[PDB]
Amino acid sequence: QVQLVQSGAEVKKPGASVKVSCKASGYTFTGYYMHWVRQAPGQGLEWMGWINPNSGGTNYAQKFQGRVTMTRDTSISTAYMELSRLRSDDTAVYYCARGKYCTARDYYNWDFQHWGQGTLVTVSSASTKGPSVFPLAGCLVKDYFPEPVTVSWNSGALTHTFPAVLQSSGLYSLSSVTYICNVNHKPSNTKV
Amino acid sequence: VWKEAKTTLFCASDAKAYEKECHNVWATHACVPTDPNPQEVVLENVTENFNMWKNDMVDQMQEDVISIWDQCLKPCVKLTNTSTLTQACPKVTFDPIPIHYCAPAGYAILKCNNKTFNGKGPCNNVSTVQCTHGIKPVVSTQLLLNGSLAEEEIVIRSKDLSDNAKIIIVQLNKSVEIVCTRPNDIRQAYCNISGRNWSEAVNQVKKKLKEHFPHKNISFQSSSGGDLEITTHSFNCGGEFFYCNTSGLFNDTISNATIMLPCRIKQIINMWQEVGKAIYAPPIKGNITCKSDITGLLLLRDGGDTNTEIFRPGGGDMRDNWRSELYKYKVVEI
Amino acid sequence: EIVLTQSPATLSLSPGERATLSCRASQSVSSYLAWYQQKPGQAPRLLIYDASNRATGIPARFSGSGSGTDFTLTISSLEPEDFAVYYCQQYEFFGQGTKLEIKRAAPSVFIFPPGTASVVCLLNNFYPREAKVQWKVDNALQSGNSQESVTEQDSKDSTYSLSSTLTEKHKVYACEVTHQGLSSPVTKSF
Ligand SMILES: *[C@@H]1O[C@H](CO)[C@@H](O[C@@H]2O[C@H](CO)[C@@H](O[C@@H]3O[C@H](CO)[C@@H](O)[C@H](O)[C@@H]3O)[C@H](O)[C@H]2NC(C)=O)[C@H](O)[C@H]1NC(C)=O
Ligand SMILES: *[C@@H]1O[C@H](CO)[C@@H](O)[C@H](O)[C@H]1NC(C)=O
Ligand SMILES: *[C@@H]1O[C@H](CO)[C@@H](O)[C@H](O)[C@H]1NC(C)=O
Ligand SMILES: *[C@@H]1O[C@H](CO)[C@@H](O)[C@H](O)[C@H]1NC(C)=O
């Protein structure tokens, strides 16, 4: 029953710092390196660094140094990643991942057998905003922030909701195609 | 004629029962006097495989150096998340002595005399001995102290140099003096080292390092993060725990000859025998001072695409400290 | 320090077929490689470790091969649950990903009229993925003022759908769609 659990999605503004948590269960926390890896929307994976929880030793990818801090608390089986001086293109889902083998095995440690659920971020000047819903004579769910939104038709009785696009305005827009579309934006407690 | 095997080594030291040094006391109970005349037989037209990283002699030297600390440096209170311990905490005389590791009957030890062996692989010039050289169980980080020195040229030792998660042991070949003193912020101490001698070392090795990489520039920087034991040249001298700041030893500009390292004396330490904290009684009065020879380095190479390859001091498992001396050896069963 | 190139960029097959994925390491000397599968909005899942070992809980239809610079992932017979994105990894380094798709349709095209006006063009259930939307306003080709997005392949028909949004002066609003399944471009207008 090995489990890795991360903190919930966080949204922060450009220039700020963020600290993501990763709570481990089912194994000896000091026995295994925890790595951090991120994923931009629709993009590949980018490794960020690793930490040794026995000692606190770290390694960071050169791409970011002094913009990222990794830590551990051995008493609560929790690893932390802090990324400072955020750029908009740091917006991504963040995963922690454990090597298959214990540090003591000294084998090839970069087989990521266990992954956290990921933490969605958003570096934006935008602020929470409910969507406007216009008819497609579908429904156009325009100018909301942040992700996500849900759409149903006829309260679930009628069963294509497209991926949102990020507009230059910094707000999202998507389309879903008696007929009534039920739109819910939890961040803004909007329900149309 | 022989096979790679495992068994119970035994230790040997030139330890007098007259002495009160804690290290000596331990040896007199667990080691036998050094064989006076040792007979080593080089073997002609032979080649033998060695893996310092899978060597079980280390595992044993680990257990023993823990043993000494268990009696030599008892903490007043040691904390883990299972267990809390409070006990007698006496101060003891403390000077590490070389330790030899010999083989019983039915077994022998094989040594690699190639002046440039990396620690994993075959060895042309192989000899046979009944007992290792004498290894001083120095516990330290970042800098390896009082060890043996490379015979000819610098040697870089790692299991997988492309793996940025593997320690890089460096065996210098020209030692560098370091003098660490606490005199009589009032737990403050300091170390002195010759910039010129240190930079000369840092270059001979930064040069050696690009040899393992294609037309890449080399950089030295302080640790990325970690417990103070990692992020400082930490050690014990006279039963007192020095944590010294090597930001002036790991830099791409190496200062004047004499450069001064701020140190601090700690009563609370994160343990290397185990996962916990050990608390110790305050430092004794006096001019605590330690002239040491830097013989090797422990380092870590940043990963992730870079045009420079960066190395940072790394503390590691102590076992690595043992590995640095027990690279040359293996255990064979006749 | 090392670069991973997987090919092809996209793999389109059918259940029961043999799957072969390649990962080419650039100048690399290691013999370790892991493979990962990822479904959308899900964590990656380790399929193969140390190049040629199947991870625990992974079915026997998965195989790994290769050493050196060129490595291979083989699935003996594609199952519905096996279509996903695939990554290789060595040390800290990841490949760019391969999309494994169901291979199988002209789009049905719809245009919707709207301080702001949004005009939406819908391309419904088409295959293959390549498609062109051109907006025209009074027969003038538009550029720079639209955005589009595409659904993941449909779980029932393996098609894609696409939505384009163009964001009083002008009279005729048209979306012109080009796709191989159309013998000539279709224009929907109002
Ligand atoms: C590396 O090895 C050298 C020896 O080759 C160690 O130097 C030794 O350091 C200890 C103290 O750390 C000295 O013992 C002390 O001596 C003073 C003055 O004699 C005395 O007042 C104390 O009660 C204590 O006995 C020892 O004399 C000294 N030996 C030499 C030859 O310098 C050095 O400490 C070792 N490095 C490490 C990190 O252990
Ligand atoms: C201490 O570590 C043990 C396992 O080594 C763990 O079961 C326990 O939860 C830890 N104590 C805490 C969480 O404080
Ligand atoms: C140590 O080896 C380096 C090359 O690795 C060489 O330049 C230097 O002269 C050597 N020093 C001694 C004292 O042999
Ligand atoms: C070492 O010294 C530098 C400046 O002298 C300081 O910024 C750094 O925090 C120190 N590191 C430790 C581990 O004390």
Q: What is the DSSP string of A43-66?
A: --EEEEEEE-TTT--EEE-TTSSS
Give A13 to chain B, closest Cα distance, Å: 26
Distance B200 CA to ligand 3 centre (A): 10
Q: Are residues A119 and A33 in the same domain?
A: yes
Q: Are residues A90 and A25 in the same domain?
A: yes
Among the three residues A85, A106, A125, which one is the final residue of a domain in this structure? A125
Nearest CA in chain A to C151: A162
Is B81 a pocket residue for ligand 2 (Cβ < 6 Å)? yes
Give C45 to chain B, closest Cα distance, Å: 22
Distance B179 CA to ligand 1 centre (A): 10
Q: Are residues A192 and A182 in the same domain?
A: yes
Q: Which residues contact C183 (CB under 8 A, 6 or more apart)?
A: none
Q: Are residues A6 and A97 in the same domain?
A: yes
Documented resolution in Å? 3.4
Closest CA to C128 of C150, C154, C103: C103
Q: Which residues contact A78 (CB under 8 A, 6 or more apart)?
A: A21, A22, A23, A24, A72
Nearest CA in chain A to C159: A160
Atom of ligand 4 nearest to the CA of B264: 14
Region class of B146: left (phi > 0), else alpha (psi between -120 and 50), else beta: left
Q: How many domains does chain B have?
A: 1
Burial of A125 (C-beta count, 10 Å sphere; 0-12/13-18/19+): exposed
Site of tokens 């030291």: B13
Distance B89 CA to ligand 2 centre (A): 27
Tell whether B304 lies on the interface with C, counting CB pairs under 8 A. Answer: yes
Is B295 a pocket residue for ligand 1 (Cβ < 6 Å)? no
Q: Which helix (H) or strand (E) holds B168?
A: strand B168-182
The enclosing domain of B262 has a CATH number of 2.170.40.20
Contact partners of A by the rule of 3+ C-beta pairs under 8 A?
B, C
Two tokens at A60? 């960071």
Q: Which residues contact C97 (CB under 8 A, 6 or more apart)?
A: A44, C6, C85, C86, C87
Domain extent for A88:
1-125
CA atoms of A44 and A38, how far apart (whole Å): 9
C-alpha distances (whole Å) from C28 to each of B274, C3, C4, C31 are 37, 8, 9, 9
CA atoms of C62 and C178, how far apart (whole Å): 39
Is B290 a pocket residue for ligand 1 (Cβ < 6 Å)? yes
Q: Are residues A117 and A58 in the same domain?
A: yes
CB–CB of B275 and A30 under 8 A? yes
Beta strands C98-102; C10-13: pairing state = parallel
Q: Which residues contact C7 (CB under 8 A, 6 or more apart)?
A: C22, C24, C98
Substitution target from B158, B160, B162 for chain C, most C beta carbons within 10 A: B162
Closest CB from C43, C96, C167 relative to A44: C96
Two tokens at B155? 């040697």
CA atoms of C147 and C78, how far apart (whole Å): 35
Query: Which residue CA neighbors atom 4 of ligand 3 most closely?
Result: B153
Experimental approach:
X-ray
Distance B173 CA to ligand 3 centre (A): 6
Q: Are residues A116 and A137 in the same domain?
A: no
Chain B residue numbers with beta carbons less than 8 Å from the beta carbon of A62 are 302-306, 308, 310
Q: Are residues A22 and A80 in the same domain?
A: yes
Nearest CA in chain B to C1: B305
CA atoms of A156 and B198, how far apart (whole Å): 73
Q: Are residues A121 and A61 in the same domain?
A: yes
Amino acid at C143: S
Closest CA to A48 of A20, A13, A23: A20
Q: Which residues contact A12 (CB under 8 A, 6 or more apart)?
A: A18, A86, A121, A122, A123
Question: First CA to last CA across chain C, in angstroms?
Answer: 55
CA atoms of A61 and B270, how far apart (whole Å): 26
Amino acid at C71: F
Q: Are residues A25 and A120 in the same domain?
A: yes
Two tokens at B234? 């930490």
CA B240 centroid distance within chain = 18
Q: Are residues A102 and A36 in the same domain?
A: yes
Is B287 a pocket residue for ligand 2 (Cβ < 6 Å)? no
CB–CB of C92 and B306 under 8 A? no
CA atoms of A136 and A133, how far apart (whole Å): 10
Among the three residues A75, A98, A125, which one is the final residue of a domain in this structure? A125
Q: Which residues contact B91 (CB under 8 A, 6 or more apart)?
A: B239, B281, B284
Q: What is the DSSP string of chain C?
A: --EEEEE-SEEEE-TTS-EEEEEEEES------EEEEE-TTS--EEEEETTTEEPTT--TTEEEEEETTEEEEEESS--GGG-SEEEEEETTEE---EEEEE---PPEEEEE------EEEEEEEESSS--EEEEEETTEEP-SSEEEEEPPPPTTT--EEEEEEE------EEEEEE-TTSSS-EEEE-
Residue ranges of domains in chain C, CATH in brackets: 1-104 (2.60.40.10), 105-190 (2.60.40.10)
Closest CB from A52, A58, A106 relative to B159: A106
C-alpha distances (whole Å) from C92 to each of B215, B233, C32, C35 are 21, 28, 12, 13
Atom of ligand 3 nearest to the CA of B153: 2
Site of tokens 């004579």: A137
Please state the φ and ψ torsions of residue B290, each to the nearest 5 degrees. Answer: -150, 105
The enclosing domain of A186 has a CATH number of 2.60.40.10
CB–CB of C32 and A108 under 8 A? yes
Chain C residue numbers with beta carbons less than 8 Å from the beta carbon of B308 are none
CB atoms within 10 A of CB B31: 21
CB C94 within 8 A of CB C4: yes
Chain A residue numbers with beta carbons less than 8 Å from the beta carbon of C92 are 47, 61, 110
Q: Are residues A63 and A118 in the same domain?
A: yes
Substitution target from C163, C164, C173 for chain A, most A beta carbons within 10 A: C163
Beta strands B217-220; B308-313: pairing state = parallel
Where are any strands of DSSP class E within chain A?
3-6, 18-25, 34-39, 45-51, 58-60, 68-73, 78-83, 93-99, 112-115, 119-120, 132-135, 139-144, 150-153, 165-166, 172-176, 181-185, 190-191
CB–CB of A162 and C163 under 8 A? yes
Q: Are residues A33 and A98 in the same domain?
A: yes
Closest CB from B163, B306, B309 relative to C91: B163
CA atoms of A83 and A90, how far apart (whole Å): 9
Distance B208 CA to ligand 4 centre (A): 28
Q: Which residues contact C41 (CB under 8 A, 6 or more apart)?
A: none
Please state the φ and ψ torsions of residue A74, each to the nearest 5 degrees. Answer: -70, -25
Nearest CA in chain B to A52: B226
Mutational pocket test of ligand 2: of B79, B82, B274, B277, the residue with most ligand atoms within 8 Å of the beta carbon: B82
Please state the φ and ψ torsions of residue B71, each to the nearest 5 degrees. Answer: -100, -40
Chains A and C form CB pairs within 8 A to the count of 100
Is A189 a pocket residue for ligand 2 (Cβ < 6 Å)? no
Among the three residues A96, A125, A154, which one is the final residue of a domain in this structure? A125
Q: How many domains does chain A have?
A: 2
Q: What is the DSSP string of C135-188?
A: EEETTEEP-SSEEEEEPPPPTTT--EEEEEEE------EEEEEE-TTSSS-EEE
